[PDB]
Predict the structure of Glucokinase.
Amino acid sequence: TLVEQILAEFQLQEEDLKKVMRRMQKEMDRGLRLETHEEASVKMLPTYVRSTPEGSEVGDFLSLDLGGTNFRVMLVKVGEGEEGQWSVKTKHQMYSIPEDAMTGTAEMLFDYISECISDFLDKHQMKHKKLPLGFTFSFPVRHEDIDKGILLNWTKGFKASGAEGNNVVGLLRDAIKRRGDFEMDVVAMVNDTVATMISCYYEDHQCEVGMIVGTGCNACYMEEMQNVELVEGDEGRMCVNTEWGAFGDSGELDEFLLEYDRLVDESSANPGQQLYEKLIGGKYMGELVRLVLLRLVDENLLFHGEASEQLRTRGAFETRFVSQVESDTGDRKQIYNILSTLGLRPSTTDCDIVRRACESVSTRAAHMCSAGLAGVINRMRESRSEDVMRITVGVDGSVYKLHPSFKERFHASVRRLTPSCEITFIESEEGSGRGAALVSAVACKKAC
Ligand SMILES: Cc1csc(NC(=O)c2cc(Sc3nncn3C)ccc2N)n1
Ligand SMILES: OC[C@H]1O[C@H](O)[C@H](O)[C@@H](O)[C@@H]1O
Ligand code: NA
């Protein structure tokens, strides 16, 4: 019966979440203040995207989406909307990064990206058009401005020599010149959390928070300028990229971490970093599951103590498997097919145990995540007057969007933790592309 008590290790009581939430708030304040911003696990990075935008330019914009291996190039059209700009994706193409240039230097990487941009401009007879480019770039960047900032480090298993520490917008502009054909006017670079927030903002002006729960996990929110000590000026408001994925990197999370968490971290491309993200993100969820499964087969609780060759190979339990397992109608068919595909022959109870393990991980993910969002929303509550703070959160990510019950658990948990708040959740259409374009269109009012 060792089973349910092994899975019980994943539970988090209310008071646990509240604790995580209050710590998250502590680290966010720490990241915003000059004296601690340098050492803070939660970097709270200024994005230079500011409030009261208008006016905005209109017309076609080119949008780049890297974060990464399968990155997108698309063409967004922005125009004078009702109380802001409308926008829409009119053309698009995905490109797979070759694991070769992916491993090669940064200039190799951005060369391949420059090519793909030409590939795209050809296919659509735009090669000669010279457009403003919005760059969605889903990694930690310390910005000097909206069109300048350096890669702090790669996340999410990404890596490519000689990129960290360099101006990312700089690398791209270079690679474009090392091509000859087109001239792209690189206007804005934004985190995906930000682009998503921006997309949703024109749908709902109360949306002041952007959140991604896919491969990785992160959020952004509108801060009061006087709180952004790393940008000068107490007047106005600026979006901040928390990069909360790194929360826990100074040990804020030690009392919650499980063996499976330590295994996942140690064997990761970035051991010691992004620990909070590794509790939630789809880069890691399936693998947590795999490790739990293996621990069960070792206590002879599962598959009759016999793991298959595949189940023993790192990364074999894809996050989408977790999501299919929890979609099982209860005829175990879905669960059987996955497990079989992994070289296993599950009994009826094997399947039910595996479903249990999936629910335990994805439920912990949903709650861990709800603590951070609640921490952000409750921080923002401090700066609002009305009795009930009504606020909208824009969200994107496969885990949040596609996993059968993650979002329900998440919503309920966030609400428990955020009294005197009315939270509305919006999912973003093409939040990355249209988000980057919308921001470019406003940034163009000063550089175009
Ligand atoms: C310096 C600079 C460059 S681009 C820029 N502004 C934007 O792109 C932009 C910012 C927001 S943030 C905001 N304001 N009120 C509420 N919210 C969430 C909303 C829409 C936008 N198009 N500032
Ligand atoms: O893609 C979602 C998130 O993944 C990681 O946490 C990146 O560091 C962050 O910048 C990004 O927003
Ligand atoms: Na300031």
Remarks:
- The first helix runs from residue 2 to 7.
- Residues 215 and 283 are 5 Å apart (CA to CA).
- The chain has two domains: 1-46+203-429, 47-202+430-442.
